[PDB]
Structure formats: C-alpha cells, structure tokens
Design a binder for these strands. Structure first.
Length: 323
DNA sequence: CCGACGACGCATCAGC
DNA sequence: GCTGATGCGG
DNA sequence: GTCGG
C-alpha cells in the first residue's frame, strides 16, 4: 500500500539515529512510518498523510516529493555517501552504537572485514556481535522458541524447583516468530526487602548443558548473552540466538511479566486507563494515587490478574494484548 | 516558543 | 584505587 | 520532527 513511503521514513530514521545522533528524530520518523503502515488507503498526497498523528509538515513535504518523483533527493545523497553509509552500517553490529561507529569510520574502519582485521579495537560485546553478525539478524521461528523454552524451564527447575521462570515478549502473546528470548526469573527467597547467586546458578546451569554459548553482560540481576539449540548429530546447526535473563523480586514479578509481555501499545493503554482509575503502574509496581496525586505504597500483586482487578479491567489473555 | 520525547543494568571510560 | 559519566541495548 | 502547554 504505502511501502515506498514507510521504507523511506524508516531509512531516514536510521540515519538520524546512527549518523546524526538525533534519537528523537529517529523516533519521530518511526512513529510516522507506523501510523502510515496502519493506514488502509494508498496515500495520494502529503496533505492526506499530514492528517495522521505523528505526520507533520516536513514529512508531508517528503511524501509529496516521493510521490511526484519516486525518490527523495536527500536520501539518495546520503545513501551514496561513503562515510555516512558506513557509519549507518556498522551500528548493525551489536555493541557498536553511533559513537563507536563514528570512531571506527573516522579511523578508516568501514566494513565487517575491517572490523575482523582490528579485533584489538573491539570490546568483548562488540567481538561477540561481530562473530554472530548474520545470526543475530535472523528471526526465530516459534517452533524453535518452544524448544528453547523447553530447555530453559527444565534447567531452571533442575537448579531449584522453587524458581519461577516466564518467557515473555511477543512469543508469550503467541507470535509466529521472535527476535530474541526474554526470560523473567524469580524465587520466593528474593523480595524487594530481602542472594547474589540466584541468577548465577541459573546462568551456570545453562552454560553447563551448553545452551548458553557466550555472555555479553552479567550482573546480580541481569544477564544478556547468546544461546543455541543443540544440533541433531547430522543436520545443519541452528543459528546462535540472543537471550536475556532478568531476576526480579517476587513481589514485583507479575508487574515485570505484564510489562515485558507488552505489547508496547497495550502497556500505554493499560497505564492510561490505570491513571484515570487512580493508580500508577510502572515496570515494578502498581501504587494508588491520592487526591492531590501523591503515590502511596505499592499494592500486593500475586498474579497478572491482580493488576487487572485493581483497575477494573477484565483479564486480558496475552494473545489479546496487541493493543 | 520551547521542552518532552523511558528508565535503568552492566561495561567501560574520564576524572580525581 | 574509587566515583560518576557515557555508551549501549532493551 | 512532531506535538502540545
């Protein structure tokens, strides 16, 4: 319908983020492309698009130029720009952000081949991101996410059957494919007012059975790393996948699951509704708001449904949290 | 006109 | 060495 | 870049 327009706007977003270091412009172009991508008519003019929330004067002017000519002069130019195209490309390496990509290109390091020749100048995260560059850009089919979940839940229970672990993200909402695996972990002994090896024990067990293959970062409450399904003796091996594991206090765990299940638009709507019912919900807690807007103490939450009950919402299955 | 636009854990750097 | 800032990813 | 107080 409008794929030329939303492709144009996405590409402009990337250069704002990765080259100009203008994160809010990045998000403006992304929000514009989203609302256009949901529009169920083929756009005929910039004025037509400008009536949508998030499309302003300047993007309307760009849509007019694209509709009249089939391209955008500024985008054509920055595409052919060796310096800018190289900075934009190098941020596809996990661990290389706009600042690192700038530094590398400044000193003549422009391609993956150049990075491979300059391992010295890459930190540990960036080396992993380079090692799995192609794998990390592949999506994960749901059937593999199910096999990964099998392993995660089994090994967690093997460490301590009192752990609770939930794979969240779009997978939990039923998505047919995922970009990564997001695991939320808690244990009855870990509360907000309460051991600095609860997460370590679980990471270690997944390493011992050779599911987790690399570590990008690891502290007492957050692990970011790499995993891979076991290959079947003779079949081609599975791509390496990104997995995060977060340990959350038990009394904050279901607020955590709700939040990291999303979707992002659902979260906005749920918190909007919660505010107009006199509650403030964030990633950690739901708290009542007094008549002058002072937040009270966090309310007890022992399930996701508790959160819905507080705000007078019928329980919504993750499958039905698209918005 | 002009400020908001998410907050935060972990790795690493800058400064002392 | 320690403390705070920055980069980065989510 | 867009929105809105």
């Amino acid at each position: 319908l409008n794929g030329g327009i939303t492709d144009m706007l996405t590409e402009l977003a990337n250069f704002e983020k990765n080259v100009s270091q203008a994160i809010h412009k990045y998000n403006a172009y992304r929000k514009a492309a989203s609302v256009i991508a949901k529009y169920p008519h083929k756009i005929k003019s910039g004025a037509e698009a400008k009536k949508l929330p998030g499309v302003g004067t300047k993007i309307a002017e760009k849509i007019d130029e694209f509709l009249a000519t089939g391209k955008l002069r500024k985008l054509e130019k920055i595409r052919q720009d060796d310096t800018s195209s190289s900075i934009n490309f190098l941020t596809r390496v996990s661990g290389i952000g706009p600042s690192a990509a700038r530094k590398f290109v400044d000193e003549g390091i422009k391609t993956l081949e150049d990075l491979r020749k300059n391992e010295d100048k890459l930190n540990h995260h960036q080396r992993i991101g380079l090692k799995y560059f192609g794998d990390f850009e592949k999506r994960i089919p749901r059937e593999e996410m199910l096999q990964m979940q099998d392993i995660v839940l089994n090994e967690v229970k093997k460490v301590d059957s009192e752990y609770i672990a939930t794979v969240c993200g779009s997978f939990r909402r039923g998505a047919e494919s995922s970009g990564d695996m997001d695991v939320l972990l808690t244990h009855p002994s870990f509360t907000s007012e309460s051991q600095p090896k609860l997460l370590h024990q679980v990471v270690e067990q997944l390493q011992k059975v050779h599911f987790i293959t690399d570590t990008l970062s690891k502290g007492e409450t957050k692990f970011m790393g790499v995993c891979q399904l076991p290959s079947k003796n003779d079949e081609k091996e599975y791509p390496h996948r990104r997995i995060d594991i977060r340990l959350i206090p038990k009394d904050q765990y279901y607020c955590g699951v709700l939040y990291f299940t999303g979707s992002d638009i659902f979260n906005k709507n749920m918190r909007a509704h919660a505010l107009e019912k006199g509650f403030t919900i964030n990633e950690y807690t739901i708290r009542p708001l007094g008549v002058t807007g002072v937040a009270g103490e966090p309310l007890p939450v022992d399930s996701e449904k508790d959160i819905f009950d507080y705000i007078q919402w019928k329980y919504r299955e993750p499958k039905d949290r698209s918005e």
